[model samples]
Target chain A: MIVVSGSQSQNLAFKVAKLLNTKLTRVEYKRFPDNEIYVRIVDEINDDEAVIINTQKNQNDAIVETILLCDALRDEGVKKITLVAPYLAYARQDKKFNPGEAISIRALAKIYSNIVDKLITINPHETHIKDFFTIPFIYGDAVPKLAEYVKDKLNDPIVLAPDKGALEFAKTASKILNAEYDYLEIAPKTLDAKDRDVFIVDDIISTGGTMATAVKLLKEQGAKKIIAACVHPVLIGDALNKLYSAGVEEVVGTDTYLSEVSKVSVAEVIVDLL
Target chain B: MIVVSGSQSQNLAFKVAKLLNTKLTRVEYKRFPDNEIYVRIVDEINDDEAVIINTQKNQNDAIVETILLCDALRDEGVKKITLVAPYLAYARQDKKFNPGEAISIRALAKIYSNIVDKLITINPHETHIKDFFTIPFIYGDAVPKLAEYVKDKLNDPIVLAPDKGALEFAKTASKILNAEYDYLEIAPKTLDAKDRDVFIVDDIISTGGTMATAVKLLKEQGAKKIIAACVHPVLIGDALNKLYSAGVEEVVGTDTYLSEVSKVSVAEVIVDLL
Candidate 1:
């Protein structure tokens, strides 16, 4: 299969290409007078199976680019197109919190399912988001690799669930690490966080609000080491600075989102599935 | 008929609704934790005809918002949807100059034609852009009105086309003004530009790159006044400041695209058709 990467997913695309031992397709791009997105697929598909890496993080321009590339790939006579979007922006807003709202994930599904045959994502905000897609898809699990990374780095670590929502991830990570695991809300006041290393994990880390708050509390509790790990490191608006200022010892984010703090790769996580 | 507007075109939408004696609908928007776009149409459509104002200029987020709104409007049971997109972003790139390039305007045509029954645009970057649209559409002419506005302001003013591309618009505007028109390249370099007020006409004014060059050359020749008129005022990144700094007397841009320099209105240009 041939590989092609969108503008935002260049780093992840290169990694995926390297892991798969394939060269990435070239995409020529230009902006029209009114900033309209224009792109061309330079690599010939020749009715072969193709892999495209298009991650939608925060910009809708990338969405347009993704749509344009998918359509172009299909039109180029690619027999099947496999999409590798490590970061999906609209997946979290899959359902309506209010009445008459647009289920963006479903809308995106219609656009994507028409152009590509399969999709691969990394630890989506919710697994059910894939159910919205008509095309076949697979999800990458970052928990195992995250656990392995933390296990080798820290001497003795306590897996922390910053809130109830992250309980499953914490439990899963602690299971792999075979270490003490506790929920932040109900960890006994006598849990003695004073001397133990704390590892906090979450799916995404945009704005770093949750991580900063947790780091502040852990520092007050006199934790010896504070390391925050995440599947997707959106880290928007001074997030890294805020985490550093809040006394976070190390911030490790997966390459799923192509962030500066990304130290882990989901390429291996999805290679076997393809 | 009911009407709705995107965030950037709210003012123009209000004007359109006012002209049509209808109320504009509301769209509730939110940026999800992952920086995803979520939009909801709060008002009711109820099988009536709906007109949506979705102008695209600098930000492609509005393009995503436009698509979401179009999808939501159709789902809301609007019998027929009319799109009043004053600024069509990709319209200028209607054709490709190189081989294997994506004809983005044609692709946008497919996307928009699927959702709306009719489209209305004011002074699109290029008139031929509509040829790619399968759906019925109307073009609003701001030239006559622009000429009328400039005529009342200055005496013995000559219409000027900065480049060959704008020669047609300059000719049309000069026909309405009943005055002399000339392209910047020729028409007697001896023509007393030192005392003549020049009305520079173009279809777009984005980044002020071309306008800055023209204004600098015109100021060198000691033109009495420099008033630049355009259909779309896509003045991005200090374009207005650069134009003023380059000695432009007044910048007259139509309400085709939402910008600070949008002083003229296209209500008369497109109101009767709606």
Candidate 2:
């Protein structure tokens, strides 16, 4: 099987390629002066099983590139193609909030499922997206590996959940560490541009906004030693600083996204699953 | 003149678009399953003069995209184009490091000059790339604006150069604020990784590795109230933590890279210059 990885998925492709000891194919991408995206695959993949790994963290041109690459692979006579996305974009807003708004998650899922033989994701928010897919689907928890990593690095550190939504992660981590776990409940307060402190724990840290808010709350609760831990550290926007300003001692995350805070590797977990 | 901003140059494009009271044209960029980049300008630009604003930072792909976009514009009968890059890549690596290695800066300059009618950049590391271009070229200083912002926000802050390279920025900021400025000079040091507080200044903060090292050295010098300021906060790797860990009271930067530490707005600067 040949593996093709996008820029965001390069780390995963590197690991997967190394584990499988397979040759990874390279693709060239460029943009036109009119700000158009251009793509061309330089390798031959006639009748070969190809896997393209790309996680649409932000709904940018990367997704379009992924789709085009799948189309290109199909044109190149690739026998089978599997799309591996650790974190799928537009998964949260599965339902439309207003009239005429598209159910983007479902739309994207249908579009992607039609082009690939199988779809594999680490931890999608909604499992129902799989129902939209006609292809073979795989979804599993990254919590086990996250717990294992927390066990190895943290020395009697308290596992925390930013809110009830992330309680599952804290519960799982507590189970693995055999330690105490707790979550911060947000009060019914509106933001007014004041600095806030919160202690946040979650399965993934996408955009870091929610985590930062949690860190602000934790600070208000007189929590000094704030450690923001998550399975995926999609530290988007000013989320990292929001956590730091809220008195977070450290922000640690597993290698879901290739971020600087990615200290723990999910290789063992992926290997076990594969 | 119509503006078609580059993806990375969204800030510049948005500013220009807002200034012109015209909507910035949207472009579609896609990555193939094989990690190839594809771009397409959604808006029609049959014969309009298009200005592409893209900064080449970190990746080589930005430069490639700029060049290709210019070529596409030319092919599409765009009479004039101004390539506005605030942070031009390959400006730092102007000279060939090893024998037979291509002078990337010169090569890129020649290519870009041929494709566009004019090229404008802010504080390019080396201005010699301008000579390589046949088109009208403009290079502006972001220092004044950066200094102005720093002076407005920080109270009794000393402008510091982490090293001699950053002394120019410190000097500029000090001049702007009429404040004291200093640089960290190491006296016979080894790479043993010691922690210390240091005050430093620079025009750009790419990766923050050098800043971290400088901060550690400053801590040893008994300097308290460490404040690191710069025009661009290109904090790559563990630079943010490294600065915080080195006991830096505050790290400030302008909105060049849109980072957490970015507090200064360069939009006014662009407007003033234009």
Candidate 3:
């Protein structure tokens, strides 16, 4: 079996590939002055089961790359293909929220499923995301892994969810760690100008604004030693500074999206699950 | 003409878009629970000339997104697509220096030229990048602008190049600003520890290791008020902290890449040139 993964997805692929004891197929990405993406697979894989793991972190190209890789592998006469995208893009917009809007989730599903035989994703936001897929789909939760990692590292740490929306994640982590979990029920606050300290938990940290806001609020609430933990540290923009300035003691994130806070590895959990 | 620029290229695009009295297109980006990127162009665009600006800062999804946007726009039949990438991706690897390495620059040029009708890049690492394009190519030097901006801001500030490679950039800026410019040279020190504070000027700040070394050297030379400026603040990893710890009073950069240190705006400079 040959494992192929995108740049950030390469971290996950590296872990999973190590667990599976397989070699990762090398691919080159070339960008031009006009800003074009060219992907070329260098390795020879004829009639091999190819597993491609790429999260649609930037959505458009990741999806395109994923589809292109799968199609390329198929064209190379790969016997079977399994796509493992720990994070699947466009899953949130499963339905058209407004008229004339594209059903991107369905569109992506149709495109990707047509190329791959099986797909595995972790902690899909919406349950209906699977409805768009025609292939064998697997959805796993990272809350247990996150919780275990946090428990093993932190000493008597309070599992605090930034908002009510993230209460489940905190609760799940708390359950695994045998610690108490609490949620801050409130509307989203402006993060940049705010000041607060609190342990914020989330599934992902894209743009870091939402987590920063939570940290600011927690600081205002007189909570100290704020440790922010999430499955994916997709620290977009100045989200890290915004969080750190808001008095976040430490930012701990699992190796989902490669970032500075990516300390814990999800390899063991993924291997056991697989 | 409508401008759709990535964060890094947005500064130039914003200036042009404002001058042209056109709306900068809005694009939504989010990650799925499984950590896939999801992108949606919210703005409506017809068959108008679409100018996209994106620099390859991290050399990952940003390049991918720029390509996907171009491809998406092409599929939508946008008239006369132009890419204004200040720091073009894959420009460094113009040729394969090592055996078994791919000529990435040539590959990137082919891909980009295939996608767009016209391309504009600023201070590409190599001049040969122009050879790869079949379309009209515009190469710009932001050194004059950087010098002009610094001159306009500071009072009789001496231009200091971070390294020998940046001497040209400093000299160009100094020539335009009519100021004295010099380069900071440092010898190899122990791997475990090193310190220096040298006031450095450059077009971009990536990793801040070069800046930190310069700053430590500058401090050693009794240079006060260590103000480091650059065009792009691609401060990766703990670069910001490293600079801060190294006693950098103020770190400033142009809005090439979106960063906290990006205080100077290159809007007027780009506008003047355009």
Model 1 CA lDDT for position A88? 72
| Models, CA RMSD each | 3.8, 16.4, 13.5
Better of 1 and 2 by TM-score: 1
Off by more than 4 A, model 3: A1-274, B5-12, B23-47, B54-59, B87-91, B97-107, B152-157, B187-199, B244-249, B272-274
Model 1 chain B: which ten-residue window has the lowest total lDDT?
B184-193
Residue ranges of candidate 2 with Cα displaced over 4 Å: A1-274, B187-199, B207-209
A138-233 per-residue lDDT for model 1 (tens digits):
887887888888887775888887777787788889899887777667342335577788888888788887788988888887887878889988
lDDT scores in order: 0.78, 0.65, 0.66
Interface RMSD, prediction 3: 7.9
DockQ of 2: 0.03
Count backbone clashes in candidate 1: 0
- Give the winner by DockQ: 1
lDDT of 2 by residue, B135-254 (tens): 787877777776665565566656667666666777787788787676655621222222323336777776666776776666675555667777667765335544554556667765
Q: What DockQ does each candidate score versus the true complex, computed on alpha carbons? A: 0.40, 0.03, 0.04
**Model 3 agreement with the true structure over B1-274: per-residue lDDT tens digits:** 7777665565667777797687878866554544444455567777468788776664656555565566456545586888877666556645544332445555456556666788877666677767867888877666665565556555555567876778888778767766667776673221111232233577667678888987776666566666677877777678899998887777877665667876766555545444
Task: Write candidate 3's Cα lDDT for A193-228 as tens digits.
Answer: 123233457887777777777676666755656788
Q: What share of the true interface contacts does candidate 2 keep?
A: 0.00
